[PDB]
Swiss-Prot record, chain B:
Protein name: NADH dehydrogenase [ubiquinone] iron-sulfur protein 3, mitochondrial
EC number from the UniProt entry: 7.1.1.2
Subcellular location: Mitochondrion inner membrane
GO terms for cellular component: mitochondrial inner membrane; mitochondrial membrane; respiratory chain complex I
Species of origin: Bos taurus (Bovine)
Curated annotation (Swiss-Prot), chain C:
Assembly behavior: Mammalian complex I is composed of 45 different subunits. This is a component of the iron-sulfur (IP) fragment of the enzyme.
Subcellular location field: Mitochondrion inner membrane
Cellular-component GO terms for this entry: mitochondrial inner membrane; mitochondrion; respiratory chain complex I
Membrane-related topology note: Peripheral membrane protein
Primary location class: mitochondrion
Signal peptide stretch: none
Keyword vocabulary terms for this entry: Electron transport, Membrane, Mitochondrion, Mitochondrion inner membrane, Respiratory chain, Transit peptide, Transport
Family, per entry: Belongs to the complex I NDUFS6 subunit family.
Gene assigned in the entry: NDUFS6
Coiled coil (UniProt feature): none
Function text: Accessory subunit of the mitochondrial membrane respiratory chain NADH dehydrogenase (Complex I), that is believed not to be involved in catalysis. Complex I functions in the transfer of electrons from NADH to the respiratory chain. The immediate electron acceptor for the enzyme is believed to be ubiquinone.
Protein name: NADH dehydrogenase [ubiquinone] iron-sulfur protein 6, mitochondrial
GO biological process: mitochondrial electron transport, NADH to ubiquinone
Disulfide bond annotation, renumbered to this chain: none
UniProtKB/Swiss-Prot annotation, chain D:
Known role: Core subunit of the mitochondrial membrane respiratory chain NADH dehydrogenase (Complex I) which catalyzes electron transfer from NADH through the respiratory chain, using ubiquinone as an electron acceptor. Essential for catalysing the entry and efficient transfer of electrons within complex I. Plays a key role in the assembly and stability of complex I and participates in the association of complex I with ubiquinol-cytochrome reductase complex (Complex III) to form supercomplexes.
Protein name, UniProt field: NADH-ubiquinone oxidoreductase 75 kDa subunit, mitochondrial
Name of the encoding gene: NDUFS1
Originating organism: Bos taurus (Bovine)
Family (UniProt): Belongs to the complex I 75 kDa subunit family.
Subcellular location: Mitochondrion inner membrane
Subunit annotation: Core subunit of respiratory chain NADH dehydrogenase (Complex I) which is composed of 45 different subunits. This is the largest subunit of complex I and it is a component of the iron-sulfur (IP) fragment of the enzyme. Complex I associates with ubiquinol-cytochrome reductase complex (Complex III) to form supercomplexes. Interacts with MDM2 and AKAP1.
Swiss-Prot record, chain F:
Topology with respect to the bilayer: Peripheral membrane protein
Family in the record: Belongs to the complex I 23 kDa subunit family.
Binding-site list for [4Fe-4S] cluster 1: C77, C80, C83, C126
Binding-site residues for [4Fe-4S] cluster 2, renumbered to this chain: C87, C116, C119, C122
Main location group: mitochondrion
Quaternary structure (record): Core subunit of respiratory chain NADH dehydrogenase (Complex I) which is composed of 45 different subunits. This is a component of the iron-sulfur (IP) fragment of the enzyme. Interacts with RAB5IF.
Catalytic activity: a ubiquinone + NADH + 5 H(+)(in) = a ubiquinol + NAD(+) + 4 H(+)(out)
GO CC aspect terms: mitochondrial inner membrane; respiratory chain complex I
GO biological process: mitochondrial electron transport, NADH to ubiquinone; mitochondrial respiratory chain complex I assembly
Listed name of the protein: NADH dehydrogenase [ubiquinone] iron-sulfur protein 8, mitochondrial
Domain 4Fe-4S ferredoxin-type: from-to ranges: 68-97, 107-136
Amino acid sequence: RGEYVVAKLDDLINWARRSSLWPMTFGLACCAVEMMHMAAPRYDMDRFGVVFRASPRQSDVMIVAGTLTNKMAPALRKVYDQMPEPRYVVSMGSCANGGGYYHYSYSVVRGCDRIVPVDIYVPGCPPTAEALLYGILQLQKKIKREKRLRIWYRR
Amino acid sequence: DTRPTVRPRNDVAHKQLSAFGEYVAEILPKYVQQVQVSCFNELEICIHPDGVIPVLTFLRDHSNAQFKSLADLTAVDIPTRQNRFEIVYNLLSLRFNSRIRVKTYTDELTPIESSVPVYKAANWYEREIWDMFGVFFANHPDLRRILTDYGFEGHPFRKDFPLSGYVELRYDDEVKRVVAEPVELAQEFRKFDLNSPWEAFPAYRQPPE
Amino acid sequence: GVRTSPTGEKVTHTGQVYDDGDYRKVRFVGRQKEVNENFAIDLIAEQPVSQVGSRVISCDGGGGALGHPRVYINLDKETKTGTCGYCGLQFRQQHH
Amino acid sequence: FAYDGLKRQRLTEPMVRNEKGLLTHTTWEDALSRVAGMLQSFQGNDVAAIAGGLVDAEALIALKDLLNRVDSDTLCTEEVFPTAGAGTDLRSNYLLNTTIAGVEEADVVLLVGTNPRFEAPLFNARIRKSWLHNDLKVALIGSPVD
Amino acid sequence: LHHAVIPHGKGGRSSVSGIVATVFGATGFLGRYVVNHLGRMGSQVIVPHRCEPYDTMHLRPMGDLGQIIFMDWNGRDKDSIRRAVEHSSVVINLVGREWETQNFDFEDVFVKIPQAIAQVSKEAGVEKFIHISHLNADIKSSSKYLRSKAVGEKEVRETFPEATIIKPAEIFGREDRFLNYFANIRWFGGVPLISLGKKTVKQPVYIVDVTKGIINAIKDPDARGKTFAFVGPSRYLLFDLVQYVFAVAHRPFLPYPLPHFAYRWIGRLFEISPFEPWTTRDKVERIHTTDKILPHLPGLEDLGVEATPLELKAIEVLRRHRTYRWLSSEIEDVQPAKTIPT
Amino acid sequence: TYKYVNLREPSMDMKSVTDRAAQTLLWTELIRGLGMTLSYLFREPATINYPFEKGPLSPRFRGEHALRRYPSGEERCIACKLCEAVCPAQAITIEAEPRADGSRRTTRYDIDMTKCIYCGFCQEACPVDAIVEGPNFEFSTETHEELLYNKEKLLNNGDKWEAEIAANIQADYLYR
Amino acid sequence: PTVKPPTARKFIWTNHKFNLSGTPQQYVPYSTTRKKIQEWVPPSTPYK
Amino acid sequence: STSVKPIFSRDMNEAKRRVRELYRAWYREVPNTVHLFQLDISVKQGRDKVREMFKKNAHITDPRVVDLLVIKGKMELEETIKVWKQRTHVMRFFHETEAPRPKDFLSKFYVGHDP
Ligand SMILES: CCCCCCCCCCCCCCCCCC(=O)OC[C@H](COP(=O)([O-])OCC[N+](C)(C)C)OC(=O)CCCCCCCCCCCCCCCCC
Ligand SMILES: NC(=O)C1=CN([C@@H]2O[C@H](COP(=O)(O)OP(=O)(O)OC[C@H]3O[C@@H](n4cnc5c(N)ncnc54)[C@H](OP(=O)(O)O)[C@@H]3O)[C@@H](O)[C@H]2O)C=CC1
Ligand code: SF4
Ligand code: SF4
Ligand code: SF4
Ligand SMILES: [Zn+2]
């Protein structure tokens, strides 16, 4: 049956993508520190298959980790567009989620979701390294639920 | 000094800073308008704006001064004054282990001589004052915005500039670029009135008009 | 406690409920309206009244420093009970 | 304590009468085009206006100009003031010329046909302050009211 | 008006426009521009979608918090349609394929579905219904796509008599499948044209103008019950149009005539594709179909929209089809196409 | 007092010159660096098996906000609005009115969790321990709207997490 | 908790719930206050 | 009191010379801007915008204020020439996404309370 075959191929490509998330080496402010602590030995994001790569062309996920300013907004959008697809965005911390504690500033974008689509929101100021990892594992479970090929088969 | 909760007073430093204050006023009477020392011992020289270069050079290079480091250069906006901007230089003397403050004034349309000739630290500090307060510094090697977005209009640190500004940014899909729009807030910043109607500090009570 | 509208929407403890014609109830389609089910007005009423033998009694909410600020309640009126302004416990004088 | 009246029974949308003869909601364009149609057809004495108690000066003059342009002088008020004699020609005829502050300097006050306690509560409170501190003599021609 | 759908604000992102719109087929070329314009002014947009949520992410930044709402629906399931319209004051239908699939054919997407959307929308008390048909829809057209547009347009007009029907010409824009279609013919060497494209006249319309007209049709009381024809300012021969595309892209243009029967067979060959056909037999008919002149119908100028010349927005669409040598060439470099004086 | 980080000169006897030449020619100090990394290869790693193993936290941890009740089940919050005033981020919006029984209670209690800096000033200001930052730190959402908390969500957080919240307040209230 | 059990209150949930984001049980925010301004309702009789 | 330190120009003739000099620099640069940033506008459009920005301040009569506008004008030119600005910053002059706002009384009356 087709519905069986496409279901199993969809699991395969879903498994590969979530099992190999390569965030861009991208970080803006305070929360970049906790993101470093998630790569540090105690949490070791690499053991889940999560590997930072500097190039946007070789990245799957953008972790927006810090305050986004008006001056910085076009640059953030640009490297997002240069990511091949599928690409996911994780908002980390209050500044990136909604402007946080500079929400009423003239120079701050009130949430990165004005500039780019967001998949997961990680609250905190900063979120702990363990909280960010929880948000990563939630992105993986989100990728695990995709039905690209099942939707194609009924299209 | 034996009241556990009260900051002790250092009378010796107050006397020395008072003496050096008169000293600077005697040598540079052409520019010095006021000299004062605070109760926590910080000396201030208030000068005419023409004397920025002569005053800063004397303090850097005089042998009984030697303020070789410019700790900070900033501006204060006081709208109630005709000269609304107060330019403040904070200087450190490593030779004598002293700090001094030199303050002058200007308005929107008056230049202040760039102090890059005395301290090369002032270059970026003046770009910041130009950008956030709109005070022009004459004879700057390169004066341009340093902190605000390219093309940003206004000088955000002026007291009459709104907290959230005038424009906000979003990504518009139609034009496939980040666009600037007039600012609207889903929740307006809530202004709190906090000042107490009862006087707190009698020693600073101003005389009745 | 929790009531429902003729439209089926639950009414919260503040009495809020989108009325019949409001489009804003579209946010609950495919999702759910979160209503806390323990209405504090109902729970504080279940508490028995405390009979005391003095004109004035003090309530701090229980737990000492873990309660509310300590306040004193006058119990001279015999047509009502004294109520804590912080926690809502009720006190009555014992016919002394 | 009357400000809570501003949150009840409020008119918030323009309304016109439908076919059944019931008021129904509509837009500003529609309602003001119906009013302009009738305003343009009529003229002169066929147009009149009555102003209420809580109407400000700007809305009053604006309506006087609009009715004057159809050539109607029938700008009326719900509150009656006798028109015989000088009428409204001289301001002094219909003003409290002494002013509220002058009550404190008067010697004799004659109140004619008025309960100032409930008509002008703070004006009445000014009479009593002068009664108290200046030994004002007050007389009343009217019903006996506390 | 309920107290919640009264306009407030200055027409910005956080304002309230008073519009509550259910947009069907919001995930395609025309839908993203429609949803972008509704979200700009502060509308509540219900976006029912058949596709994977990953394919709707470009819509998320189009509205303030809460304003864009997403629902799952199935074009043959009336209950899914009802859940998505019952709270809306305007329902916009942009559902359509340019090709047929094993599951959904031109009858289903242009007749069965729009009429099921129209029937449910009226039973649910939706005030305004907006239907997108086609300029060249005809019962006697040799494009099964256009014959289905004609049949659905009548069903929609009978199921929702107050429906506003909009008949656009072929729409160009960064995701159009019109000027991108021609610029991608370079991959096959020359450009096969029926009768060398000298017997076909087109009147393409800019996407933003179609979107602006739709937005006004919602906010304009007069638009109700009418049929509109959205067409561009100029009429071009297909040959002159395709020649202009290749000049803007700076590609070598080698047009050669291909008989109708043959170019049909090419269409049949590309249809075997199990994904998105590069071309189909129907696409052959539509491209080589003279865009009708409907003077009795009102147009964009009635809705208040000034049609944008193809010569102001072609570089915008076609600059990505250039090579590095020509990327930086400017809008004035190329010769304007010859326009049929009408 | 001071010391010199790098003000020592090398000896020039024949043996020391030879020793530095053997270091230059045979790469001795580079080999030494390889020994250090080699020793780490045989050390137990510091990684923990998250989510099965968690990081250590203390009772003071500032996590997710919750609204608390008295043991009777009445709400502790009295709508005093000191949490609202102290909040550095203006994340709290409160509205209040008399309840049916006359109690001073909130009709609106919103915390915008994307404004909040998780500073805990609000729990310091509250005079009745009504608002607390709970121990939870694992409440990531897939939408921005899911992080704008109203009073029902916050009361449900307190009901959900009361058991742990009370135990932590018990461990720390003598320091407060 | 097997050695030092938690205190029992009536209102405490008897059934823990994990993160429900992304599901039909998620939390949808909404204003909890009632309407501020009441609107005059025109009479339903035919007047004149 | 009317005696005031000059910024550059001693009178309005010296200041207007700098206005014209700045207009020439902006006029010459527009063709390069449209090319480098790959703008869809025409060189005519860009020059009409530069002209428009220069008419907003045509009523000024203070030499010191004129000098500041010229100083700010030259700062903006450098950001454009050196490509510190981006395409988004250049296109902010054209307000392409802002919808037209009514100017007359009735249209403004129907939408809201703003004067
Ligand atoms: C050595 C290096 C490593 C090599 C790795 C090799 C790859 C291993 C994984 C291969 C799995 C397949 C990868 C699919 C990737 C395609 C791109 C993609 O996923 O996009 C989604 C797209 C879906 O696109 P779509 O049509 O739904 O939507 C496109 C439009 N937008 C963009 C708006 C969404 O997939 C496809 O379009 C085609 C997928 C075809 C899958 C393969 C054919 C199906 C075969 C089984 C079913 C056939 C019928 C039943 C047969 C029963 C009898 C046999
Ligand atoms: N040049 C043009 O583009 C012109 C277009 N039109 C009409 O305008 C409307 C929009 O066209 P456009 O949006 O450009 O085409 P698109 O293919 O770009 O978008 C069409 C939409 O239809 C949806 N759709 C198609 N089939 C189904 C189905 N069986 N069930 C549910 N949804 C479906 C698609 O959803 P999914 O992505 O989920 O498949 C997509 O969102 C169409 O009606 C089209 O005929 C008319 C004249 C010119
Ligand atoms: S969210 Fe908090 S930690 Fe992160 S950048 Fe903002 S203030 Fe710093
Ligand atoms: S933790 Fe701090 S920022 Fe967050 S709500 Fe409390 S006081 Fe406000
Ligand atoms: S949570 Fe505490 S501080 Fe805030 S309003 Fe309630 S009682 Fe006052
Ligand atoms: Zn109590």
